[PDB]
Design a binder for this molecule. Structure first.
Ligand SMILES: *[C@@H]1O[C@H](CO)[C@@H](O[C@@H]2O[C@H](CO)[C@@H](O)[C@H](O)[C@H]2NC(C)=O)[C@H](O)[C@H]1NC(C)=O
Ligand SMILES: *[C@@H]1O[C@H](CO)[C@@H](O)[C@H](O)[C@H]1NC(C)=O
Ligand SMILES: *[C@@H]1O[C@H](CO)[C@@H](O)[C@H](O)[C@H]1NC(C)=O
Ligand SMILES: *[C@@H]1O[C@H](CO)[C@@H](O)[C@H](O)[C@H]1NC(C)=O
Ligand SMILES: *[C@@H]1O[C@H](CO)[C@@H](O)[C@H](O)[C@H]1NC(C)=O
Ligand SMILES: *[C@@H]1O[C@H](CO)[C@@H](O)[C@H](O)[C@H]1NC(C)=O
Ligand SMILES: *[C@@H]1O[C@H](CO)[C@@H](O)[C@H](O)[C@H]1NC(C)=O
Ligand SMILES: *[C@@H]1O[C@H](CO)[C@@H](O)[C@H](O)[C@H]1NC(C)=O
Ligand SMILES: *[C@@H]1O[C@H](CO)[C@@H](O)[C@H](O)[C@H]1NC(C)=O
Ligand SMILES: *[C@@H]1O[C@H](CO)[C@@H](O)[C@H](O)[C@H]1NC(C)=O
Ligand SMILES: *[C@@H]1O[C@H](CO)[C@@H](O)[C@H](O)[C@H]1NC(C)=O
Ligand SMILES: *[C@@H]1O[C@H](CO)[C@@H](O)[C@H](O)[C@H]1NC(C)=O
Ligand SMILES: *[C@@H]1O[C@H](CO)[C@H](O)[C@H](O)[C@H]1NC(C)=O
Ligand SMILES: *[C@@H]1O[C@H](CO)[C@H](O)[C@H](O)[C@H]1NC(C)=O
Ligand SMILES: [Ca+2]
Ligand SMILES: [Ca+2]
Ligand SMILES: [Ca+2]
Ligand SMILES: [Ca+2]
Ligand SMILES: [Ca+2]
Ligand SMILES: [Ca+2]
Lengths: 130, 194, 971, 129
């Protein structure tokens, strides 16, 4: 079942390398020509095709899904605290948190700022945990 | 819905109807013949008979957002553990009947995404998708260590399992299943690709 | 207290500091949660989903079901329950109606109390419903429509006979209305302004009680308190019923909030009404009315009698089909009452309806491109008492496009549309007997109709060059009645009185009739006055048809040339698709009315199928499986022929009849693992392929008729061979090797060996000796099925796309069809020898090693389930397992057929018998002929012909077309 | 009648009526037209007739629109390509039958037609002088 599904189930993809690329019925198509994939997947939240274009067409979700203290992820349909939105780390599965222009957030004196552009409480700076 | 089948795909049957949330965990008792599951929309932890014939809601007073559930049903332990993602994210432990409740970890949890138990050592293993770590502690949370912690190895973990001296987890950000050594992570392998 | 959210229903204890949320076992899995209602006398809770369905579950979780799935059209928006009369009331906007249903006992009774009637009092878009049983009053809230129905709060009687409007104005986007039985007061909320209002059941007073909200779902009143929920504020809270000035909050930050109910032991003795006082006083439905009196009403498909106690079922009505539902209309156009319980619900896409009036059944077909379960044929009774699925397995990619019913033979005929092919099949209405009568290839039969009086079957074709065709009940004859003047025949109907055929076309915009014997075409109601006639039926001196654009049902006189303005039966019907009639007159049963049809009595004695043939006084019989017997009525399954398979060592035999558990020959055991088998009619002998260890392949033959002779061996050590094929015309054996990537040929005794071709992983070989072709399967890179001559001198891929892991291959010489199995795509596919047509036979629960075809069935063996399976080779319409779970993983399968053509009956088929031109049919064996015009001459043997002068060249050469000779080595 | 009429062959084919200076446009037939190969007008009655080889029909309408009427429909008229009106008769040509036919213009009549010339190849239009 696995030897032709668009999923490289092993290190070198020996399974998928042998398959044809003609987009049989119900197979949604992707611009990279990697593999044609079943239409049901189009808006489930998984980048099923290599160039991120299965879901690219899909519409946006109901905005009432999350509380005012939260931000919403379009691909996953999950809610994360507002502070996380532009902290500089992609928290949503598809990166919906870092959007457009963030007006970059900065670190206050009660916290410390490290190599990866993250802000951490001063007590954590040296306690045994990275 | 929740379904039960044999390891060869036969005898597919329905245990009970289930919540639509993507964040859900199921636990089974090989002794008590009971099944436990978490509900993310109703914010509840529920127990039933393994055949689904009887159903009850067991914990509802403070489980804001369950993201993990693990059980130890041995005669001398009889303990249940679960994790919550409220504004005060924590890991909580309660008697398997809910008559006793305690909070085990609450100082650095920010996005709990995994809960598993190690019975010989009587240890809990949990995963965090914000600080990107895999960490284990004991049933009281008084002993705690970190197995893997880095933005390079853990991107978006969702489930954790343990076997022998190895820990297995799943990552949605890399579409992969990973194996590592549960004590120091100095061994890393990919179990399933794509 | 009970609260609803779009995905959950849960219960709160009624004191505000008890924060537990499990006063009842919750209801998980809801998709589009809407209002809820409860019944305490049976511990039941009911909820509605919009978009969705009406469901009931028990407070302890013991039971969960869908309560009105077949009559509900669209989605309901409000529920009300009467515990005194034991009736439930629900409101549906898709049909602009308010309906009542009876909870008493296992037999549902349901009618529509209020709908559109042109007056503003009538129901518009009813969203909310509340009922009072003791006073026999019903209240509803409705957004109104463009018919002049205002946004209103309205009052009616629970029997539906009285209508009045209580409140109007300042009402936009009103969602719920609720009633208080002690105060006799009504409460409703408005989203356009964020306020909750109170009113009196007589319309005497209106007041405002809550002042600042944003989309407040739900109102409930119990004792001194009123409870409401708000979406944007995510809160559920309680307020003083008498003041509105003080508030308490039960829960907060709850999303997707919906309406609320309160649960307590309300009792019928206190709330008693006329129906409770007079049990059993109505045959179907009892509805209370003011003054303690009661009224009786009949369910859909029934009418009421002057005694008021009894109801009688409709026996003469018209049936109309619309993509979303099937409905019935009385012949009396003054009667707008439902003549049958409607058919509506999820998955409905009705294309055609047909009726068996004598048995009391209606049969309809559903067709959806996007949903498997929606496609099929199903039958229901007008009373809704019975529902059954007649055809749900073996449906083509394009679905079922036509259903015809024969009430004399008790037969159903339908058309099944695959990708490049269409099939016409007949099924006996109450038995598991289904057969395919015709394969149509390029024509696309969709609409089908049958006439038992004239013993004719008619269908319409929708492909290129559309036409109408006539056939006999067994499809053994094909004739075309209309070729010219057809573009889009949306509907086909036959008249059983005159034996005339009528069709409608929305491209031509015409209704036209022809005679069963063809000839002159005639025109009815042509012109722009008929924009889109989609369905037509004939009854008496009238024709009845439906129009998709005018949204109307019309009646006119069937005689051509008449131009009386038509007659109308129903207005404002959406998505009309077909019309049918349910009346004893349209389906006669007297022999004089049916021209002495032989199947009218005891199915003509036929075992499987009975088919009246025009001008044949005796019945005709057809078998769904096997063959027909000299008695002319019964069928047999050729016990002279059997199936042979190997488990590992044990060669075993099986019978085509799954009930005939006898073994054709007892079981035989061989060394190692037997993997592939082939049989020959000449010797009553089997050739089998043997694996001794993971490295050693072996070939051996065994004899069945030679007493009990043990095996004989042809080759002792070769790579592991997985496929074997036999050629009885040339007396050769062909085998494939997996360890050596090769396909080799040998002679019957092994003394001669040759190698035909090389392909990676050559699992299967198939042979046709009379045509000189062999086929093989390669599952390596560029997985393909390939064809070559018996000698491998010519080679071409028959299938090289949409194929991944071909591991089984078989050929059928009766149909000239090739079948293969794919383990990656888990499916069985059939095509022609050229690969020009491709269809899928099986796509579900599929694992297979071998493949063989006999009769109307295809058989395969499965190693995962350790079973052998039989299916129908054209559509997989049947699936059964011929054996219990076998002891060990099956191997490849072959068939033992004694009627094999041991010699080629048409010798010219072997590449023109070797010729270039016209081949004579075996005068002295195969023989050759040139064109009779021009001085041609026969050469090489009596074979090539392009020699216009008889020119001479030496015999040691070979002599070509165009008059040239060349040394044989170059040949 | 001071009218100008033309037929349209694109998507949603129709027949239109106009004034001699085309300052007015009106549509007489929209439904029931697929391939109007020929259009003719009767100068006596002020009626318009058209022929269609897809519909295989001869049909007439009134200069003020309204009710459509049918003449010689059916398979007996495989490909009427051109039509003209003269007196109480209509004359039309058929591409497949290779014939010229004369019939009476009033609808509903079914007298067998009359033939004028046989074996004429590639017939396209008929006119009267
Ligand atoms: C097929 O089975 C149905 C259901 O058993 C038969 O339906 C009965 O038909 C008789 C008349 O022949 C009625 O009087 C009964 O009321 C029907 N029973 C039910 C339960 O509906 C039907 O006769 C059988 N044969 C056919 C051709 O439908
Ligand atoms: C590829 O698919 C198209 C349909 O999308 C089909 O028409 C064509 O024949 C296919 N090509 C091959 C080589 O099968
Ligand atoms: C549960 O909630 C109560 C009341 O809000 C609080 O006092 C208690 O600390 C909470 N317990 C936990 C484990 O969060
Ligand atoms: C673990 O990793 C080390 C290298 O870090 C390697 O030498 C060793 O063989 C590994 N052990 C196992 C059991 O994989
Ligand atoms: C409800 O479930 C029980 C479970 O045993 C079953 O016996 C019963 O038939 C079901 N239906 C009704 C109406 O009780
Ligand atoms: C359905 O039909 C069967 C027999 O065909 C009958 O026994 C049964 O009562 C029917 N169903 C109902 C609800 O009457
Ligand atoms: C079948 O049709 C042919 C003409 O197509 C006709 O001659 C023949 O009589 C028909 N069969 C029977 C049994 O009448
Ligand atoms: C056939 O299979 C059984 C187990 O399925 C095995 O024990 C037996 O040895 C096999 N036959 C031979 C000849 O090895
Ligand atoms: C495979 O083929 C070669 C010749 O191509 C032959 O020598 C050998 O015996 C065959 N069988 C095996 C098992 O290699
Ligand atoms: C597939 O077969 C066609 C002819 O049927 C041929 O032209 C084509 O090149 C083949 N493609 C492959 C990949 O074998
Ligand atoms: C699957 O396992 C069940 C027992 O758990 C058994 O009854 C069944 O035969 C098994 N099926 C197969 C195909 O192994
Ligand atoms: C032009 O046509 C319109 C309708 O389209 C009509 O009302 C008007 O009278 C016509 N022009 C003249 C001058 O009559
Ligand atoms: C996305 O869709 C939602 C509804 O699903 C809302 O319409 C919202 O306004 C939409 N637009 C954007 C850009 O979020
Ligand atoms: C960073 O952000 C904080 C608020 O979180 C303060 O605005 C601070 O002044 C900022 N620092 C810089 C350098 O802009
Ligand atoms: Ca794969
Ligand atoms: Ca996807
Ligand atoms: Ca972020
Ligand atoms: Ca630290
Ligand atoms: Ca039309
Ligand atoms: Ca034509």
């Amino acid at each position: 079942l696995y030897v032709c599904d668009g999923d490289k189930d092993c290190v070198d993809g020996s399974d998928e390398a042998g398959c044809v690329l003609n987009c049989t019925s119900s197979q949604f198509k992707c611009a990279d020509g990697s593999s044609c994939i079943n239409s049901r997947y189009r808006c489930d939240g998984v980048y099923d095709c290599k160039d991120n274009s299965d879901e690219a067409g899909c519409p946006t979700r109901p905005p009432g899904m999350c509380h005012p203290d939260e931000f919403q992820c379009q691909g996953d349909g999950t809610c994360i605290p507002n502070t996380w939105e532009c902290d500089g780390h992609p928290d949503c599965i598809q990166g919906s948190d870092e959007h457009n222009g963030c007006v970059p957030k900065t670190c206050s004196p009660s916290h410390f700022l490290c190599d990866n552009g993250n802000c951490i409480y001063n007590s954590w700076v040296c306690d045994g945990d990275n | 819905k929740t379904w039960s089948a044999f390891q060869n795909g036969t005898d597919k049957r329905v245990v009970h109807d289930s919540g639509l949330s993507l964040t859900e965990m199921i636990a089974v008792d090989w002794i008590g013949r009971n099944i436990y599951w978490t509900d993310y929309t109703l914010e509840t932890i529920e127990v039933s008979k393994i055949d689904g014939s009887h159903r009850t809601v067991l914990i509802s007073k403070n489980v804001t957002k369950p993201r993990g559930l693990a059980l130890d049903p041995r005669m001398g332990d009889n303990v249940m553990f679960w994790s919550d993602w409220g504004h005060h994210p924590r890991i909580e432990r309660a008697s398997m009947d809910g008559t006793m409740r305690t909070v085990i970890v609450q100082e650095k949890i920010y996005w709990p995404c995994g809960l598993s138990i190690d019975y010989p050592n009587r240890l809990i293993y949990f995963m965090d998708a914000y600080l990107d770590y895999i960490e284990f502690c004991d049933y009281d949370g008084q002993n705690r260590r970190q197995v893997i912690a880095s933005d390079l190895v853990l991107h978006h973990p969702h489930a954790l399992t343990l076997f022998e001296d190895s820990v297995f987890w799943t990552d949605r950000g890399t579409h992969q299943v990973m194996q590592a050594n549960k004590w120091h992570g100095r061994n890393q392998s990919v179990v399933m690709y794509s | 207290l009970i609260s609803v959210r779009e995905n959950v229903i849960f219960g709160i204890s009624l004191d505000p500091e008890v924060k537990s949320n499990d006063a009842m076992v919750p209801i998980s899995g809801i998709q589009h949660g809407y209002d809820v209602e409860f019944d305490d006398s049976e511990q039941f809770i009911y909820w509605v989903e919009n978009p969705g369905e009406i469901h009931r579950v028990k407070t302890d979780g013991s039971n969960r079901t869908a309560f009105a799935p077949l009559s509900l059209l669209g989605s309901s928006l409000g529920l009300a329950l009467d515990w005194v009369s034991r009736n439930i009331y629900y409101t549906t906007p898709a049909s602009r109606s308010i309906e009542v249903l009876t909870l008493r006992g296992d037999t549902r009774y349901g009618k529509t109390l209020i709908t559109n009637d042109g007056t503003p009092l009538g129901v518009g878009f009813p969203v909310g419903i509340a009922v009072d049983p003791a006073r026999g009053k019903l209240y509803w809230s409705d957004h109104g429509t463009d018919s002049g129905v205002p946004a209103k709060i309205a009052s009616a009687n629970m029997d539906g006979t009285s209508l009045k409007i209580l409140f109007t104005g300042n009402m936009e986007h009103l969602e719920v209305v609720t009633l208080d039985i002690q105060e006799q007061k009504l409460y409703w909320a408005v989203t356009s302004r964020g306020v909750i209002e109170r009113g009196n059941v007589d319309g005497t007073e209106r007041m405002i009680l809550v002042h600042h909200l944003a989309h407040p779902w739900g109102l409930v009143v119990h004792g001194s308190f009123l409870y409401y929920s708000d979406e944007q504020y995510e809160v559920i809270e309680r307020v003083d019923k008498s003041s509105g000035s003080n508030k308490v909050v039960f829960r907060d930050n709850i999303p997707y909030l919906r309406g609320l109910r309160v649960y307590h032991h309300r009792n019928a003795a206190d709330s008693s009404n006329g129906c409770s006082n007079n049990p059993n006083a109505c045959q179907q439905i009892c509805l209370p009315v003011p003054g303690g009196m009661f009224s009786c009403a009949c369910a859909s498909g029934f009418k009421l009698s002057p005694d008021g106690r009894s109801c009688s079922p409709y026996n003469s009505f018209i049936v109309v089909s619309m993509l979303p539902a099937v409905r019935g209309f009385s012949l009396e156009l003054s009667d707008h009452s439902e003549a049958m319980v409607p058919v509506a619900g999820q998955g409905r896409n009705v294309l055609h309806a047909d009726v068996d009036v004598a048995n009391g059944f209606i049969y309809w077909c559903d067709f959806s491109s996007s949903v498997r379960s929606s496609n099929g044929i199903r039958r229901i009774k007008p009373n809704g008492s019975n529902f059954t699925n007649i055809v749900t397995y073996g449906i083509g990619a394009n679905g079922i496009r036509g259903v015809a019913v024969d009430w004399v033979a008790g037969n159903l005929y339908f058309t099944n549309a695959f990708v490049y092919e269409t099939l016409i099949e007949v099924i006996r209405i109450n038995t598991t007997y289904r057969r395919v009568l015709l394969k149509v290839s390029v024509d696309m039969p969709r609409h089908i109709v049958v006439d038992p009086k004239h013993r004719y079957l008619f269908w319409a074709d929708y492909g290129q060059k559309p036409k109408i065709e006539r056939s006999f009940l067994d499809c053994t004859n094909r004739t075309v009645l209309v070729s010219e003047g057809i573009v889009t025949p949306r509907g086909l109907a036959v008249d059983h009185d005159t034996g005339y055929i009528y069709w409608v076309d929305d491209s031509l915009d015409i209704i036209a009739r022809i005679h069963r014997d063809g000839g002159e075409s005639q025109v009815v109601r042509y012109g722009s006055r008929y924009p889109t006639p989609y369905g037509i039926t004939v009854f008496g001196e009238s024709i009845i048809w439906v129009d998709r654009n005018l949204r109307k049902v019309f009646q006119a006189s069937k005689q051509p040339g008449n131009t009386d303005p038509p007659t109308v039966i129903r207005d404002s019907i959406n998505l009309l698709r077909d019309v049918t009639i349910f009346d004893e007159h349209v389906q006669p049963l007297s022999p004089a009315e049916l021209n002495n049809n032989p199947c009218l009595q005891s199915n003509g004695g036929c075992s499987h199928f009975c088919f009246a043939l025009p001008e044949l006084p005796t019945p005709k019989c057809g078998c769904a499986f096997g063959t027909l017997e000299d008695d002319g009525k019964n069928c047999a399954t050729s016990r002279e022929d059997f199936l042979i398979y190997s488990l590992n060592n044990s060669l075993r035999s099986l019978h085509f009849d799954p009930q005939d558990h006898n073994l054709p020959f007892q079981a035989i055991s061989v060394e190692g693992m037997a993997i592939a088998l082939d049989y020959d009619r000449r010797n009553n002998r089997i050739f089998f392929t043997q694996k001794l260890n993971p490295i050693r392949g072996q070939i051996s033959y065994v004899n069945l008729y030679s007493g009990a002779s043990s095996p004989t061996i042809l080759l002792s050590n070769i790579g592991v061979t997985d496929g074997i094929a036999f050629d009885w015309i040339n007396r050769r054996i062909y085998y494939s090797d997996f360890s050596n990537q090769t396909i080799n040929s040998m002679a019957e005794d092994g003394s001669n060996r040759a190698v035909i071709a090389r392909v990676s992983k050559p699992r299967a070989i198939v042979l046709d000796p009379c045509r000189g072709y062999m086929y093989w399967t390669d599952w390596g890179t560029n997985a393909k099925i390939e064809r070559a001559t018996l000698g491998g001198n010519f080679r071409v891929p028959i299938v090289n796309t949409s194929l991944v892991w071909p591991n089984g291959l078989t050929l059928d010489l009766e149909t000239d069809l090739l079948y293969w199995a794919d383990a990656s795509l888990q499916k069985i596919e059939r095509s022609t020898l050229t690969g020009s047509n491709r269809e899928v036979v099986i796509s579900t629960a599929f694992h297979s090693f071998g493949l063989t075809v006999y009769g109307q069935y295809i058989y395969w063996t499965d190693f995962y389930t350790k079973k052998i399976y039989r299916a129908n080779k054209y559509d997989g319409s049947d699936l059964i397992a011929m054996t219990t779970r076998l002891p060990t993983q099956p191997s490849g399968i072959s068939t033992v057929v004694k009627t094999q053509q041991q010699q080629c009956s048409n010798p010219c088929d072997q590449f023109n018998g070797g010729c270039s031109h016209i081949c004579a049919p075996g005068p002295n064996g195969a023989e050759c002929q040139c064109p009779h015009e021009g001085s041609w001459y026969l050469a090489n043997d009596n074979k090539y012909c392009v020699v216009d002068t008889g020119a001479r060249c030496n015999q040691f050469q070979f002599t070509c077309l165009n008059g040239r000779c060349i040394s044989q080595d170059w040949k």
